[PDB]
Each structure stands twice: as structure tokens, then as C-alpha cells.
Amino acid sequence: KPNVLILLFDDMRFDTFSYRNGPVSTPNIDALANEGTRFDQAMTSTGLSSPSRAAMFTGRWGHKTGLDDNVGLYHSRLSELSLSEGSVIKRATSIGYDVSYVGKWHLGAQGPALRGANFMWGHDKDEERNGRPFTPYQTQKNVARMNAGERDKNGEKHDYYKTLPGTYADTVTAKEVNEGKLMLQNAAKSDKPFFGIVSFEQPHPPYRVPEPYASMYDYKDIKLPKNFGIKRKHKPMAQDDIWWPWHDVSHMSETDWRKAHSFYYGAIAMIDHAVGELINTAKEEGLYDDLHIILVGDQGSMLGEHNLYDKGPYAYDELMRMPLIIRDPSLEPKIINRQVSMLDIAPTLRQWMTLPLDGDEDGRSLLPLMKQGDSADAGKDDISLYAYEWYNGGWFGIRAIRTPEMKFVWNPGDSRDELYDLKNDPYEITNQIDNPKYKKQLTDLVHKMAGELNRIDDPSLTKFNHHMKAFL
Amino acid sequence: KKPNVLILLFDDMRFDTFSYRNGPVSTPNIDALANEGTRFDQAMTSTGLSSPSRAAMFTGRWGHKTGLDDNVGLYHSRLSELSLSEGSVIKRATSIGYDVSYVGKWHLGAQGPALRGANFMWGHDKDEERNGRPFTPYQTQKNVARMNAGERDKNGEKHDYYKTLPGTYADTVTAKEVNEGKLMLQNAAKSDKPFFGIVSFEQPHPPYRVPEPYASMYDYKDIKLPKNFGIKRKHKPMAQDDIWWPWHDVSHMSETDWRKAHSFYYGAIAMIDHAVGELINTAKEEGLYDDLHIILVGDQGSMLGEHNLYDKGPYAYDELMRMPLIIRDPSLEPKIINRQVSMLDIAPTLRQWMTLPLDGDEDGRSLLPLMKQGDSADAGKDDISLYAYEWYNGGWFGIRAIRTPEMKFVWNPGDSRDELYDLKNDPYEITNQIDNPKYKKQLTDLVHKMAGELNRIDDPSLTKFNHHMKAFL
Ligand SMILES: O=S(=O)(O)O[C@@H]1[C@H](O[C@H]2O[C@@H]3CO[C@@H]([C@H]3O)[C@H]2O)[C@@H](O)[C@H](O)O[C@@H]1CO
Ligand SMILES: O=S(=O)(O)O[C@@H]1[C@H](O[C@H]2O[C@@H]3CO[C@@H]([C@H]3O)[C@H]2O)[C@@H](O)[C@H](O)O[C@@H]1CO
Ligand SMILES: [Ca+2]
Numbered sequence: 006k007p008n009v010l011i012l013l014f015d016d017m018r019f020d021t022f023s024y025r026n027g028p029v030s031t032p033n034i035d036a037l038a039n040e041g042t043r044f045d046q047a048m049t050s051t052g053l054s055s056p057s058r059a060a061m062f063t064g065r066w067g068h069k070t071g072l073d074d075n076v077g078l079y080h081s082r083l084s085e086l087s088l089s090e091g092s093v094i095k096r097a098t099s100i101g102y103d104v105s106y107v108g109k110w111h112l113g114a115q116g117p118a119l120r121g122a123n124f125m126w127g128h129d130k131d132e133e134r135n136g137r138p139f140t141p142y143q144t145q146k147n148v149a150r151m152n153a154g155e156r157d158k159n160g161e162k163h164d165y166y167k168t169l170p171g172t173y174a175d176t177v178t179a180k181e182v183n184e185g186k187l188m189l190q191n192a193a194k195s196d197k198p199f200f201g202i203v204s205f206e207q208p209h210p211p212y213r214v215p216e217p218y219a220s221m222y223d224y225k226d227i228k229l230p231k232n233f234g235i236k237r238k239h240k241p242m243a244q245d246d247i248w249w250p251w252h253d254v255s256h257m258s259e260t261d262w263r264k265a266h267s268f269y270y271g272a273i274a275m276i277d278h279a280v281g282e283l284i285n286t287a288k289e290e291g292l293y294d295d296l297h298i299i300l301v302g303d304q305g306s307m308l309g310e311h312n313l314y315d316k317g318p319y320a321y322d323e324l325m326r327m328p329l330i331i332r333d334p335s336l337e338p339k340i341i342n343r344q345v346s347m348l349d350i351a352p353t354l355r356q357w358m359t360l361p362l363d364g365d366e367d368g369r370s371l372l373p374l375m376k377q378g379d380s381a382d383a384g385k386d387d388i389s390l391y392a393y394e395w396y397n398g399g400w401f402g403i404r405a406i407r408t409p410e411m412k413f414v415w416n417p418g419d420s421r422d423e424l425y426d427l428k429n430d431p432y433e434i435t436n437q438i439d440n441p442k443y444k445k446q447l448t449d450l451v452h453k454m455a456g457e458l459n460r461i462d463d464p465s466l467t468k469f470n471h472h473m474k475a476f477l
Numbered sequence: 478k479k480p481n482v483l484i485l486l487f488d489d490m491r492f493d494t495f496s497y498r499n500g501p502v503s504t505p506n507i508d509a510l511a512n513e514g515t516r517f518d519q520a521m522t523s524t525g526l527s528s529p530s531r532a533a534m535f536t537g538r539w540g541h542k543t544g545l546d547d548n549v550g551l552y553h554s555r556l557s558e559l560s561l562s563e564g565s566v567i568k569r570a571t572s573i574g575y576d577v578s579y580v581g582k583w584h585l586g587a588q589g590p591a592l593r594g595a596n597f598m599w600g601h602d603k604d605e606e607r608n609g610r611p612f613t614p615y616q617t618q619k620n621v622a623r624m625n626a627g628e629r630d631k632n633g634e635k636h637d638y639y640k641t642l643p644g645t646y647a648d649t650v651t652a653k654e655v656n657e658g659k660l661m662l663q664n665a666a667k668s669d670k671p672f673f674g675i676v677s678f679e680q681p682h683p684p685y686r687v688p689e690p691y692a693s694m695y696d697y698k699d700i701k702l703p704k705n706f707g708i709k710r711k712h713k714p715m716a717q718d719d720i721w722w723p724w725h726d727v728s729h730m731s732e733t734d735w736r737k738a739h740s741f742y743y744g745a746i747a748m749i750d751h752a753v754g755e756l757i758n759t760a761k762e763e764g765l766y767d768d769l770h771i772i773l774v775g776d777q778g779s780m781l782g783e784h785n786l787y788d789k790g791p792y793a794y795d796e797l798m799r800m801p802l803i804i805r806d807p808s809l810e811p812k813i814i815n816r817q818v819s820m821l822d823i824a825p826t827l828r829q830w831m832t833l834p835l836d837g838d839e840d841g842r843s844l845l846p847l848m849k850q851g852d853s854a855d856a857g858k859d860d861i862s863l864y865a866y867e868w869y870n871g872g873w874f875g876i877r878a879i880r881t882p883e884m885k886f887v888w889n890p891g892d893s894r895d896e897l898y899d900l901k902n903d904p905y906e907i908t909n910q911i912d913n914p915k916y917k918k919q920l921t922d923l924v925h926k927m928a929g930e931l932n933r934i935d936d937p938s939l940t941k942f943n944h945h946m947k948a949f950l
């Protein structure tokens with residue numbers, strides 16, 4: 006029974022790290038990447054916290070678990086993942102793992118502890134269940150201030166980026182790290198196999214870091230991507246609407262957008278420090294050599310691509326793609342360019358830990374790819390499936406299928422679907438859904454999507470077959 | 478011996494506009510029907526939204542039972558049609574030998590009245606394919622962007638709010654609906670079978686679009702605006718702030734724009750009163766009127782700048798929740814009913830008139846006892862109405878309101894903020910008393926009445942209600 010450590014980051018993009026030729030020096034994460042299996046085409050299940058984390062820890066899609074929206078936020082109907090879903094936490098506890106959780110669960114108050122984990126520290130550890138949804142009255146007020154031409158301290162916009170006082174040592178990140186260090190120190194004292202999960206606040210927006218992380222990256226020097234700042238042409242209406250108050254970016258100057266990038270880059274540098282501290286503690290405690298490690302970000306985050314901030318009901322790569330490293334100490338490092346999914350984490354843990362079956366696995370174990378490289382999947386369709394069923398009480402029922410060359414997005418709450426040529430338009434600027442030059446690729450993707458919805462028993466297959474009747 | 482029944486169903490018609498209600502618009506034809514029938518002056522819709530209200534009206538069950546709990550065919554609702562497993566009063570009446578006819582929009586799925594056995598004579602959704610993509614309001618979005626830039630449409634108007642149409646009454650959709658209604662009455666008078674006719678009028682759905690002389694009949698300069706007009710919402714739920722449909726951004730509206738929204742609406746009500754006169758005079762000419770069992774109703778009201786709101790959205794304010802209702806039974810002397818009654822009470826009333834067969838639960842009650850006896854039919858009973866706003870076009874809110882003659886409590890389980898209004902001292906619902914200790918006893922009473930109602934209708938939200946209201950429970 007191997008020791009397992011999961012380092013789980015909130016809204017961390019795939020692309021920012023130096024090992025991915027990104028703009029931020031990340032030596033600690035690069036070292037882990039180069040020692041483990043790099044999943045360079047990892048895709049989240051949904052660009053939203055609770056749905057992604059329920060998929061990650063259960064191995065099933067939201068229509069099976071019921072966890073298909075964020076919990077405890079205006080205006081979601083949901084409060085918690087059902088205690089009927091034990092997740093890998095209860096399954097690992099059931100076979101003699103000491104499971105520990107640091108940081109926020111995002112799946113209901115007390116959730117890790119109710120499933121048998123030592124919930125060492127975190128926002129939702131001691132909260133009462135069935136709380137009223139958090140309704141962002143203060144954020145609404147503050148975005149109205151920005152629209153009136155006001156700024157916060159030192160000309161900043163604190164719903165986007167903020168210089169925190171004090172030092173790294175004063176941060177929530179430093180606390181999460183210290184509880185992870187304690188978790189590793191305490192596991193080294195035990196005979197029993199351990200399963201540790203550290204769920205980091207960072208880099209959740211707004212981008213809030215102390216000096217020197219706050220000014221490490223000069224906003225003037227930021228390289229803005231080709232889809233930055235553009236007007237959305239022929240895109241679905243859900244990308245326009247102000248779902249969370251800070252989605253009104255009409256007030257953002259180019260300087261505001263560059264600081265959103267530079268402060269985000271500071272947060273990634275601070276995360277790289279935090280990863281180094283935890284890895285060095287595992288090494289000091291003699292746990293690192295045999296440690297089975299997953300580093301993952303639940304989803305990415307928008308920094309003004311398509312003039313979007315944060316996240317919302319859409320499928321763009323900057324949100325859908327996720328960073329993923331899985332380090333098996335028995336295996337030589339490889340880089341996997343075949344697409345993989347958040348639905349593949351629970352099966353991988355299941356194979357590592359011999360977890361007991363608790364129902365369906367909608368994904369697959371990544372051990373064959375980790376051992377053999379991309380040739381494990383020779384002959385198979387290279388696809389990923391993404392869902393955006395809800396955004397905080399807005400129903401959208403979105404489904405995206407992504408091949409290495411194309412993406413088709415079904416928006417059943419709209420009349421406008423999306424079709425992107427990823428080979429010729431990797432920045433997803435031009436919606437080709439109505440372009441007759443793409444009829445063959447669309448027809449192919451529609452068939453692949455029907456096959457995926459059938460495979461996972463998604464009940465929206467019926468509506469899909471109605472909407473796509475021109476192609477069947 | 479089965480009676481002839483006619484339903485005149487109007488879209489977003491307020492309770493208060495008519496001259497028989499001491500309102501601003503001269504409505505002699507509707508007044509004559511009110512004076513001949515049973516006035517339900519405290520009628521409440523089930524939801525301030527078309528498809529939910531009409532599924533409640535025609536099934537007699539709440540949308541958690543029927544599944545019809547949002548609009549159909551609109552960005553970004555999940556729904557397309559009322560299940561064919563719900564026959565409604567249409568199939569039920571057909572099954573017992575009524576010739577059922579439908580004129581105008583169904584709003585419950587393409588071909589719906591026809592699939593249930595009605596002659597769907599004419600209407601927007603009569604010949605449409607089913608399972609169509611949701612109508613997504615790209616042009617209204619672009620229009621409101623022009624408004625926000627300071628633009629006006631032709632002649633200074635704002636056509637997402639009010640519009641002078643060219644030509645005459647005779648050129649209008651209203652005139653076409655009336656012509657098909659006249660043919661319906663003429664056809665009924667020639668048949669042996671009892672008839673059940675439903676005319677579902679487009680008017681007065683916003684924007685307020687009428688030809689001359691209705692467009693200028695009521696001078697915008699003379700419009701009396703109410704006490705809750707134009708106010709800043711204080712301590713009100715976040716769902717009232719959000720621009721759900723693009724025309725909900727009224728930041729660009731002048732006081733003149735709001736007065737023309739009223740004056741064009743009043744013109745539409747005058748045009749409706751003409752249309753009602755035409756159909757009633759055809760019923761009289763055909764020898765049907767003396768024995769005709771009539772319901773006149775608006776599916777819900779509509780906001781005209783009260784709490785700075787336009788049209789409708791997920792909220793429970795009286796101008797939306799209240800509906801006009803007149804029920805005329807030719808065997809009964811006229812009465813005014815001030816007890817609250819609900820859209821859930823229409824299907825049971827039809828059931829008692831027509832001896833319709835049982836097709837499951839009735840969540841409301843027949844209004845025949847009130848029509849015969851007056852308000853004292855309900856002596857010793859709590860005077861309450863229940864309202865739900867489960868969805869607004871793909872936005873989930875799960876709202877429930879209970880209204881007594883003196884108080885309203887609104888539960889907003891998508892929010893941290895509930896509403897409590899003192900209707901006796903604050904009938905304009907300006908002040909949210911939810912946190913005011915002086916109202917603790919009334920709030921406790923309303924929370925218990927709401928729990929009782931959710932239990933009665935087997936609403937599965939009662940679990941969450943018991944958590945949110947645990948300080949009571
Ligand atoms: O930790 S939380 O994600 O729960 O923090 C939330 C909230 O985060 C949200 O912000 C918007 C709305 O939903 C998404 C994002 O698009 C979610 O990340 C955060 O912004 C707010 O300030 O704190 C709450 C917790 O109270
Ligand atoms: O006759 S319809 O109601 O179907 O017309 C709709 C639309 O009406 C809607 O307008 C907003 C969105 O939901 C409510 C209201 O709040 C609904 O009445 C109408 O405005 C538009 O012009 O036409 C569509 C049908 O195509
Ligand atoms: Ca997240």
C-alpha cells in the first residue's frame with residue numbers, strides 16, 4: 006500500500022510553468038514534472054470548483070453523483086456532496102489508510118471528516134452544514150465603485166489583483182504548507198500507509214500576494230496572447246452575461262489586465278516556493294523516495310482571453326486545460342500528449358492503492374500511459390469530454406468534445422454552438438459552426454459526442470439527438 | 478347539459494388597470510363581464526412567468542409535479558414542452574365529448590393543443606417542429622446596447638419598451654386572434670357537441686406595441702406613477718439586481734420612457750377591451766352568450782418601474798403576483814370575492830363545470846362555492862396564497878412566497894436574504910422587514926404557514942426550508 010500525496014491547486018492554469026515554456030520560473034514544480042509523468046494535454050471535467058472536485062474524488066460525472074454545480078454560492082441549489090458518495094477518502098480509510106486533508110473541501114462543511122479523514126485545518130472544517138448560499142453583496146458594491154472610476158489602495162483593483170501586507174510567512178499558503186509539513190512529520194511516525202491531500206487556496210482570484218511576489222513580474226513586460234482583449238464574434242450569449250459581479254470587466258484598462266497577469270504570475274512563483282518546502286520536508290522525513298504524488302489544478306482561469314476574467318459557462322482551453330503531474334517512483338519519466346481527463350484521477354488512485362469498487366469509473370487508470378507512454382493508446386480516438394451543466398444556479402447543459410485538431414461545443418440553452426479549428430486557430434477566436442468548409446469535421450464530432458454521452462449514460466443524449474438531427 | 482366554456486387568456490395583463498377596479502383605463506366590455514360574473518379581486522398567479530403559470534392553469538398541479546417549472550424554448554431554460562403524459566383540461570374535456578378549440582400561443586410546446594385533441598385553429602406554435610433550439614435574444618441585447626449609448630429608435634421611442642405600430646387595429650395580431658375567435662364561436666353554434674374554446678391573446682405582452690389611435694389614446698404626460706416607482710431597492714435580494722433578460726437593464730430609461738411604457742400599456746388594454754367586446758357580441762349574435770361559462774384571466778401581471786423593475790423576473794411583488802380574474806356562471810348572481818384565490822383554482826373550477834375526469838391531484842380548489850356564497854364560503858379558514866418562482870429562463874431560484882391580506886413572506890433559498898412585507902402599512906412593499914424584531918411574531922406565523930403549504934403539495938424543497946428556517950421550526 007503506497008504512500009500518496011495530492012497537491013491540489015485552485016484555478017491554476019496549464020501553461021504558466023517554465024517546464025511548459027511558460028513565463029514563470031517554477032524550479033520546484035519543473036523538478037517534479039521531470040521526475041514524474043507529465044500529462045501535458047490534461048483536461049478538467051468542468052471549469053468550476055465543486056463539479057471538478059466531485060469528479061476528481063468520486064471518479065463519476067455530476068449526473069451520477071448529483072454534484073453538478075458549486076455548493077453554498079448564490080444562486081446554486083446545492084449545499085454538499087451526498088454522504089452516500091464516500092469518495093476515494095472513505096474507500097482509502099476502509100482498507101487502513103490514514104487519510105488527512107488540509108485546506109478547503111468545496112464539497113460541503115465537515116465533508117473530509119464525515120468520510121474518515123483527519124481534517125487538520127481548512128475553511129469548511131468546523132462550519133455548520135446547510136448554510137445559506139454566500140451572496141456577493143460586497144463584490145457587487147466594489148465592482149460598482151470600479152465602474153464609477155474609483156480604485157482601491159495604490160491604484161489597484163482588489164476584485165482582480167491586490168498587494169497583501171506582510172510576508173509569505175503571514176499567508177494562507179504558508180499555513181497550508183505548515184499543516185502539510187506536520188502531516189508528513191506525523192505520517193513518518195506511523196506504521197500505516199498515508200493518503201494526504203493539500204488543497205491550496207492559491208491561485209484563486211483575485212490575485213492576492215505579499216511582496217516580493219506582488220512586484221516580481223513587471224506588468225509592463227507581460228506578453229499578452231493573440232485572443233487577449235478581443236471582441237467576441239459569433240459566440241454564445243452565456244459568455245456575455247455578468248454571472249458573478251466581477252465578470253463586468255468594462256472598467257478594466259490594459260494596465261489592469263497586465264496586473265491581473267503579473268499578480269497571477271507572482272502567485273505561481275509563491276506556489277512554486279510552497280511546493281519546494283513540502284517536497285524538502287518529504288525528503289527530510291524519508292518519505293519522498295517512495296511517495297506517489299499527484300500535482301493538479303482543478304481548472305484554469307481566464308486573464309482577458311476573449312475579454313473574459315476568472316471563469317464562467319464556456320469551454321475555452323485556458324479554463325478547460327489543467328496542469329497535471331503524476332509521479333510513480335517505480336517508473337521512468339515520460340511526457341503524455343494523449344488527452345486525459347479529471348475523470349482519470351480516481352481510477353489511477355484506485356490502481357495505486359487497490360481501492361475497493363464503489364460503483365462506476367467514468368474515466369480510466371493512467372498507469373498504462375505512465376508505463377508505456379502515448380503508445381498505450383495507439384489506435385484509440387484521442388478525445389476529451391468536458392461538461393458545464395451549471396454555473397452557480399444558471400443551468401447551461403454545455404458539453405464539449407476536443408480532439409487534437411478540433412473542438413465542438415454544444416450549448417443546449419442557446420441556439421449557437423461553437424466549432425473551433427485548434428490546428429489553424431488554437432486561440433479559438435473564430436466560431437466555424439456555420440462554415441460549410443467544416444461540415445465533415447462537425448459531423449464527425451457530433452457522432453463522437455453522441456458516443457460519449459451514450460458511454461456515460463448522460464440523459465441529455467435525447468435532447469442532443471433532437472438538436473443534431475441534421476447530422477444523424 | 479355539459480356547459481359551453483370560453484377562456485379569454487391575456488399575457489402579462491395586470492390586475493389593476495381596468496375601470497371596474499377604479500384603474501386608469503376605460504374598459505366598458507371587461508367591466509360588463511365583471512358586473513355580470515364573479516369578480517376575483519384578490520386572484521394570485523402561481524408564478525410570474527408564462528409557461529409555469531399556464532401549465533399550472535391547464536393541469537391543476539404545481540410544476541414540481543408536472544415537471545413544467547420554467548419557460549420553454551427560451552435562453553437558457555432546459556425545457557422544450559409539457560410532457561404528453563400531462564393531457565391537461567384539453568385532453569380531459571376531449572375525452573368526455575367537448576369540441577376543444579385553441580386560438581393563439583400555447584407556450585407549452587409546439588403542436589401541444591393538437592397533440593391533446595384540440596382544434597388548434599391558429600397560433601405561433603401550431604405548425605412549428607418540436608424540440609427547437611431556445612430563442613436567444615441576440616437582437617434585444619444589441620438594441621439595449623444602443624439604448625445605453627444614448628440612442629433612441631424612430632420618433633424618440635424605445636422599441637424594447639414601447640412602439641407605435643403602423644396601420645390600424647384591423648392589421649394587428651389582436652384583430653387576427655379575434656377573427657379566429659369569431660370563427661370558433663360561429664363553428665360552435667353549428668355543432669351538437671358542447672364546446673370549450675380558449676383564446677390566448679399576445680397582448681398585453683411587452684414591449685407595448687399598438688397602432689394609432691391606441692398608441693396615443695392615453696397621454697404619457699398625465700400618467701400617475703405609484704409610490705414605489707423609480708426607487709432604489711433597499712435590502713432586497715440580489716436576484717432583483719441582475720440583468721436576466723437584456724431589457725432588464727433600465728439604467729438608460731428616462732421618466733418619460735417609463736410614462737410611455739405606462740401609456741402604451743394603457744393603449745393595449747383599451748385595444749384588448751375592444752377585442753373582448755367583439756368576441757362577446759359574436760357570442761350574443763350566435764345565441765351562445767346567455768348560457769356561456771366564461772373565464773377572463775391574465776397569466777401574471779407586469780412591472781412598469783415599481784422598485785425600478787420592468788417586465789418580470791424572479792421576485793414576488795404584487796404588481797406581478799396579482800392577476801385579473803373574472804369567472805361568469807350564467808346560473809349565479811354576481812358577487813365580488815375579496816378572499817385570495819390562485820391560478821391552481823382554475824382547473825378544479827373547470828372540472829366542476831364540465832364534470833372532467835380525475836387525472837391525478839388537484840393542488841387547488843373549485844371556486845364554485847365562493848361564486849355561489851361569496852367570501853363567507855371560506856369563513857374560519859386562513860386567507861393565504863402560495864406563489865413559486867422555481868426558475869427564470871434557466872436561472873434556478875426556488876423562490877416561495879406566502880401572502881396573507883396583511884403580510885407577505887418570501888423565501889429566497891438561492892440567497893441569504895429573505896423578504897418580509899407589511900402589506901397593511903407598506904402595500905408598495907418598499908421596506909424589507911425580515912430583520913426587524915417588531916415583526917418576529919408575524920414572520921414566525923408566516924414561516925409555519927409556508928411549511929404547512931409545502932407539506933400539503935409534497936414540495937421536495939420542504940427539507941431545505943426546515944434547515945433555513947430552523948430558528949422557527
Ligand atoms: O472558495 S470559494 O471558491 O468558495 O470562494 C468563494 C468565491 O469563489 C467564487 O467566485 C466566483 C463565483 O464562483 C466561482 C468564481 O467564478 C468561485 O470560485 C470567492 O470569489 C468569494 O470571494 O469567496 C467565496 C467563499 O465565500
Ligand atoms: O411570446 S413569448 O413569451 O414566447 O415571447 C418571447 C419573449 O418573451 C419573453 O421575454 C422575456 C423573457 O422571458 C419572458 C420575459 O421576461 C418572456 O415573456 C419575447 O419578448 C420575445 O420578443 O419573443 C420571444 C419568443 O420568440
Ligand atoms: Ca477552482
Ligand SMILES: [Ca+2]
Binds near residue numbers: 488527
Ligand atoms: Ca405571461
